[PDB]
Amino acid sequence: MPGFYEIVIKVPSDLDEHLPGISDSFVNWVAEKEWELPPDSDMDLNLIEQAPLTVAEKLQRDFLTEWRRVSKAPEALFFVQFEKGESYFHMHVLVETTGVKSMVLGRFLSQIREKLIQRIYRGIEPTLPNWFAVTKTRNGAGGGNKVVDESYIPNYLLPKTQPELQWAWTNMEQYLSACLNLTERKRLVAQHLTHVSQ
Amino acid sequence: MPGFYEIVIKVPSDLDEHLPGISDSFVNWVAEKEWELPPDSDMDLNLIEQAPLTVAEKLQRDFLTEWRRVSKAPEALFFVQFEKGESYFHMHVLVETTGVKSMVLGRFLSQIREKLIQRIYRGIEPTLPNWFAVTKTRNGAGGGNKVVDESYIPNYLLPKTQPELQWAWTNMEQYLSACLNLTERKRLVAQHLTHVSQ
Amino acid sequence: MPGFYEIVIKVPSDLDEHLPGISDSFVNWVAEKEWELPPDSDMDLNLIEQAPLTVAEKLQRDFLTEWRRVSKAPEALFFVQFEKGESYFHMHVLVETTGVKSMVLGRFLSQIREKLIQRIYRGIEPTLPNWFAVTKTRNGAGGGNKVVDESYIPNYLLPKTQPELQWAWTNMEQYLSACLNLTERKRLVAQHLTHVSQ
Amino acid sequence: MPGFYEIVIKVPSDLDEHLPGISDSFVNWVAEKEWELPPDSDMDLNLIEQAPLTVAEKLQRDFLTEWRRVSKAPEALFFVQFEKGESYFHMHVLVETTGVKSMVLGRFLSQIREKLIQRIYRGIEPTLPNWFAVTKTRNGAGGGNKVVDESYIPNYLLPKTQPELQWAWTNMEQYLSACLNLTERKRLVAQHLTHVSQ
DNA sequence: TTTT
DNA sequence: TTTT
DNA sequence: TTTT
């Protein structure tokens, strides 16, 4: 089975310490974009933010479009998950490694970061510590890219629920009902635990 | 029997920390060079890289051509082996000492390094720590060149298998089947161990 | 009728004053390329150079490919002419204005120059005075792009013959025989003079 | 007919102003080399020097060997002439343009100068004003290489006699007797004058 | 100490 | 070593 | 990627 990558995206949450010299048009366009909830979900109307989700969905859509334009393959699997943190809001992704190798991944990631800066931030570099970086295999000096197998999502992304879990955009067929429903996620976690117990 | 030399070559694996200011033509020509596997081998389709092997074969071919042009002898024995490492990818070579002495070897190695920089990197000096250096006999100050006898390959290059072993280019007659097959390598290792046990 | 643009390209002719620090691979590839003459031409074997023509044809082919890739239109009219000068060798072009406006032409020309520098010279900027520039309408401060109509080629490019004329690559149907033959060029000049005399 | 090049070489004539810090081995080897005169000549035993001629013949032999090694053609025409000057001794050459173009001539001349410096002076650059340079066509900025046709030798090198003429090394068949004999040179000059008078 |  |  |  083809491997997957893990790219963490940090979403800011301040205007007087994270985005210096911000404009009124950006916040006016962000705040004027409300969202609703599907009837086949199980979330809360007060535990889900608006502007952070609105910018996270735009960032993930821009990343997906950039990946589809670079790899020239619209049928690319992805699994984005916005998980609430204590210091800064983080978002994980599971992009397949079909096409892109590993040595050229650095230049592609740099170009994606530059495009996201010139698009969302309109050419403004935030002062967040390593807000756009990738993980490695934790070696010494010059470690390779960390790969993601199948036994990684049900042990680090599925058990994460409220209030940590915010929104999960899937693409697989066996995860259409386990995106916003906690019962399907718990069933999948139990199935994985019973499978790995053999 | 004539001795052999051991020259280690370090292959980079990053574009935003190893090759500053890398043009797009180089990576476009490197990524657009796929390779296949021979039917008389025993490797894996996922444990073998593409771009690292593609640049390593080009580097070893350039080194062989430069050695044949300098020594003016096309019948030169060689044994290149690309071994995977923890920090950086390394490649060992076993070039015979027919023609070149030892004092002039430094200038020849410097010229070969300059030619490889002006050819592969097109006049770009990488920031890798001692990426192009030779080994010595480990003495005090001003040690001689380390020679390689016959009892060196089956104890440091043959036991190295997957996932450390990537590709082994041979030239001898008794090593044609022990290049990509693990059974022949194990048989040769056992034969050497039984021979040195007397 | 759609207008045309006039972009002058300067070709160097020195290695110890124009291209500081040039590798031997470039000159080795340039010197190993010989061209012949078609039987339906009328030129000289001594008045036509080799390396300047060989680099000019490559530059014009790269420019045509870049224009076809940017404008996304392979059916683009062009008329390149390499004219010998007293100070530096110059080459004129007649690219149609189908697709590209005038305000975005500056960024496109800058990108084309950067690509030609990173491809031919491979990250080497020559010290020639304004070797890559475009002409204007000669006004005050902020003149627009100089357009080229139909009454411009037979009065500035057709009368230019030997030894000034080196090679003329056309694309029109009425100029297929007036590329290397002086009789057709003289006939076209006489026809234009008789037409403008009314 | 193929053209010819004109490269002027300046020969020093001082040790305490031209070659600072010169070893005694050079002058010891120069002074220990005496030359004679052929019986089929017409020169003088007092008007012909020894050390300038001895270094000029070695310089021209080294230049001829370097040209034959670079162009890979031993059958190369040449016509060297050591002419006495008022300021510094100069030597002219007439090397054919078979093989070498004009753009790569600069790098070849620089390499020849570097080899002559590292071989004759053993890596010592003299302080003579432009002692190793080539002539141009006298234009503005970026003039090409000055070519030498047939009507150039009998009007600038043949009339130059004693005490200006020192030694003329030829290679042609019609100039074997006009190398050291003034009668043949005068006859050739008269023939050229009668030919150009038509 | 130079066409070994 | 540049229309693989 | 600007009269959603």
3-state secondary structure D80-134: EEEECCCCCEEEECCEECCCCCCCCHHHHHHHHHHHHHHHCCCCCCCCCCCCEEE
Closest by CA to D4, choosing from D102, D72, D85, is D102
Check: CB of residue B42 under 8 Å from CB of residue B126: no
Give the nucleotide at minimum CA-to-C1' distance from A119.
G1
Closest by CA to D104, choosing from C26, A179, C189, C77, is C26
Measured at the CA of A178, the angle between CA A177 and CA A181, to 5 degrees, comes to: 90
Copy the structure tokens of residue C147.
């357009």
Amino acid, res. D101: K
Q: What's the rounded Cα separation, in Å, for the pair A1 and C63?
A: 43
Check: CB of residue B125 under 8 Å from CB of residue B12: no
Closest by CA to D119, choosing from D185, D177, D66, is D66
Copy the structure tokens of residue B174.
């008794």
H, E, C per residue of chain C? CCCEEEEEEEECCCCCCCCCCCCHHHHHHHHCCCCCCCCCCCCCCCCCCCHHHHHHHHHHHHHHHHHHHHHCCCCCCCCEEEECCCCCEEEECEEECCCCCCCCHHHHHHHHHHHHHHHHHCCCCCCCCCCEEECECCCCCCCCECEECCCCHHHHCCCCCCCCEEEEECCCCCCCCCCCCHHHHHHHHHHHHHHHCC
Q: How many CB pairs under 8 A join B and C?
A: 19
Q: What's the rounded Cα separation, in Å, for the pair C79 and C93?
A: 5
Q: What's the rounded Cα separation, in Å, for the pair C65 and C43?
A: 28
Q: What's the rounded Cα separation, in Å, for the pair C11 and C89?
A: 5
Q: What is the DSSP letter of D146?
A: P
Q: Which of C51, C87, C88 sits opposite D103 (nearest CB)?
A: C51
Q: What are phi and psi of C142, to 5 degrees?
A: 105, 45
Q: What's the rounded Cα separation, in Å, for the pair C78 and C98?
A: 12
**Residue listed under structure tokens 């025409």:** D77
Q: What's the rounded Cα separation, in Å, for the pair A129 and A10?
A: 9
Per the DSSP assignment, residues forming a β-bridge with C6 are C94
Given an 8 Å threshold on Cβ–Cβ distance, is C118 in contact with B21? no
Going by DSSP bridges, is the β-strand pair D80-83/D89-92 parallel, antiparallel, or unpaired? Answer: antiparallel
**Angle in degrees, 0-180, between the axes of helices A51-71 and A24-31, rounded to the nearest 10:** 100
CA distance D14 to chain C (A): 29
Check: CB of residue A193 under 8 Å from CB of residue A103: no
DSSP H or E segment with residue A64: helix A51-71
Residue D16 Cα distances to A188, B140, D21, D32, D89, angstroms: 94, 46, 8, 21, 17
Burial class of residue C4, CB neighbours in 10 A (0-12, 13-18, 19+)? buried
CA B13 to chain centre: 16
Write down which chains contact chain B via at least 3 CB pairs under 8 A: A, C
Q: Which of A104, A141, A142 sits opposite B15 (nearest CB)?
A: A104
Straight-line distance from the first to the last Cα atom of chain D, in angstroms, rounded to the nearest whole number: 21
**Rg from Cα positions in chain A:** 18
Q: What is the DSSP letter of A164?
A: T
Copy the structure tokens of residue A154.
């049900």
Burial class of residue A131, CB neighbours in 10 A (0-12, 13-18, 19+)? middle
Amino acid, res. A120: I
Q: Is the dihedral of CA B54, B60, B65, B69 positive or negative?
A: positive
Given an 8 Å threshold on Cβ–Cβ distance, is B16 in contact with A101? no
Indicate yes or no: strand E within 7 A of the C-beta of D115: no
Residue B138 Cα distances to A50, B6, B144, angstroms: 65, 14, 9
Copy the structure tokens of residue B159.
């036991």
Residues 6+ apart with CB under 8 A from B145: B5, B102, B105, B134, B136, B137
Closest by CA to D136, choosing from C16, C126, C52, C121, is C16
**Residue listed under structure tokens 């002219």:** D92
Residue D128 Cα distances to A17, A156, B184, D20, D170, angstroms: 66, 77, 69, 11, 28
Cβ atoms within 10 Å of B29's Cβ, excluding its own: 11
Query: How many Cα atoms sit within 13 Å of B32 on the Cβ side?
Result: 6
**Residue listed under structure tokens 């082994």:** B168
Is D90 labelled a binding residue?
yes
The reply to whether omega before A163 is within 30° of 0 (cis) is yes
Instruction: Output the CA torsion D96→D99→D103→D109 (10° steps).
Output: -60
Residue D42 Cα distances to B192, D86, D161, angstroms: 81, 23, 11
Q: Most distant CA pair in chain C: distance in Å?
A: 57
Measured at the CA of A101, the angle between CA A100 and CA A103, to 5 degrees, comes to: 120
Copy the structure tokens of residue C60.
């014009």
**Angle in degrees, 0-180, between the axes of helices B51-71 and B24-31, rounded to the nearest 10:** 100
Q: What's the rounded Cα separation, in Å, for the pair B132 and B126?
A: 10
Closest by CA to B187, choosing from B158, B150, B161, is B158
CA distance C6 to chain D (A): 23
Burial class of residue A160, CB neighbours in 10 A (0-12, 13-18, 19+)? middle
Q: What's the rounded Cα separation, in Å, for the pair B118 and B124?
A: 7
Q: What's the rounded Cα separation, in Å, for the pair D138 and D144?
A: 9
Q: What's the rounded Cα separation, in Å, for the pair C42 and D67?
A: 34
Q: Is the dihedral of CA D95, D101, D107, D108 positive or negative?
A: negative
Q: What's the rounded Cα separation, in Å, for the pair A90 and A8?
A: 7
Closest by CA to B26, choosing from A107, D43, C156, is A107
Chain B CB contacts of A142 under 8 Å are: 13-14, 87-88
Distance, CA of D108 to C1' of F3, in Å: 30
Per the DSSP assignment, residues forming a β-bridge with B134 are B7
Closest by CA to A144, choosing from A92, A86, A83, A102, is A102
Amino acid, res. A1: M
Q: Is the dihedral of CA A105, A109, A115, A118 positive or negative?
A: negative
Distance, CA of B24 to C1' of E1, in Å: 54
Residues 6+ apart with CB under 8 A from C132: C9, C10, C109, C113, C116
Q: What's the rounded Cα separation, in Å, for the pair C163 and C43?
A: 10
Q: What is the DSSP letter of D26?
A: H
CA C32 to chain centre: 23
Check: CB of residue A189 under 8 Å from CB of residue A159: yes
Is D192 labelled a binding residue?
no
Q: What are phi and psi of C121, to 5 degrees?
A: -75, -20
Q: What's the rounded Cα separation, in Å, for the pair D176 and A55?
A: 91
Helix (H, G, I), strand (E, B) or coil at A30: helix
**Residue listed under structure tokens 């005038």:** C102
Amino acid, res. C36: E
Q: What's the rounded Cα separation, in Å, for the pair B133 and B119?
A: 18
Cβ atoms within 10 Å of B190's Cβ, excluding its own: 11
Q: What's the rounded Cα separation, in Å, for the pair D51 and D34?
A: 9
Going by DSSP bridges, is the β-strand pair B89-92/C132-134 parallel, antiparallel, or unpaired? Answer: unpaired
Category of D99 on φ-ψ map: left (φ > 0), alpha (ψ -120 to 50) or beta: left
**Residue listed under structure tokens 């999948």:** A188
Q: What's the rounded Cα separation, in Å, for the pair D69 and A91?
A: 66
Q: What's the rounded Cα separation, in Å, for the pair D136 and B92?
A: 52
Amino acid, res. A150: E
Is A83 labelled a binding residue?
yes
DSSP H or E segment with residue A96: strand A94-96
Copy the structure tokens of residue B162.
């997957």
Check: CB of residue D64 under 8 Å from CB of residue D95: no
Q: What's the rounded Cα separation, in Å, for the pair B172 and B77?
A: 7
H, E, C per residue of chain B? CCCEEEEEEEECCCCCCCCCCCCHHHHHHHHCCCCCCCCCCCCCCCCCCCHHHHHHHHHHHHHHHHHHHHHCCCCCCCCEEEECCCCCEEEECEEECCCCCCCCHHHHHHHHHHHHHHHCCCCCCCCCCCCEEECECCCCCCCCECEECCCCHHHHCCCCCCCCEEEEECCCCCCCCCCCCHHHHHHHHHHHHHHHCC
A interface toward B at CB cutoff 8 Å?
101-104, 106-107, 110, 139-142, 144
Category of C116 on φ-ψ map: left (φ > 0), alpha (ψ -120 to 50) or beta: alpha
Q: What's the rounded Cα separation, in Å, for the pair C76 and C93?
A: 12
| Segments in chain D forming alpha helices (H) | 24-31, 51-71, 105-119, 153-156, 182-196
Distance, CA of C104 to C1' of F3, in Å: 29
Q: What's the rounded Cα separation, in Å, for the pair D41 and D184?
A: 11
Q: What's the rounded Cα separation, in Å, for the pair D18 and D20?
A: 6
Q: Is C121 among the catalytic positions?
A: no
Q: Which of residues 72-111 of D touch strand E (CB under 7 A)?
A: none
Q: Which of B88, B121, B156, B175 is catalytic?
A: B156
Per the DSSP assignment, residues forming a β-bridge with C141 are none
